[PDB]
Amino acid sequence: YGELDFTGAGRHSNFLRLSDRTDPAAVYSLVTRTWGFRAPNLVVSVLGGSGGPVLQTWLQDLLRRGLVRAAQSTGAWIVTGGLHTGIGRHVGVAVRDHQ
Amino acid sequence: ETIVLKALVKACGEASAYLDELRLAVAWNRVDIAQSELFRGDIQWRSF
Structure with missing residues (x-):
């Protein structure tokens, strides 16, 4: 059932x-x-999701100004899930915080 | 200034015209409260 490709950009992602x-x-x-x-x-x-609630504060701070700090310093695009509930939520918290 | 803020949310916490803890920091015209309320403190802000 691998027919075609049918989407593009949107939302500016x-x-x-x-x-x-x-x-x-x-x-x-x-x-x-x-x-x-x-x-x-x-x-x-x-990679690695939570059980649903918020992660710990220092893991959050590891993503806040430990990882995204290393993103803006070095280019460094982060490859994650994208859903607002997995680890992509908590990484998405960190990107929205750091910008 | 946050403890004063802390007492009002316990007061409004589900009848009195939901004070929302961040709508209040706008009305006080104090920016440093409004950042740390939104940047930290169990960040679960919904739409409304």
């Missing part, structure tokens, strides 16, 4: 839907060439 088997390269070229942010200088992919 730039999303899309794709399949699993698609491409290593044509994703990242479509990050860097089309709607290019930059090439990174690192990437910190963050």
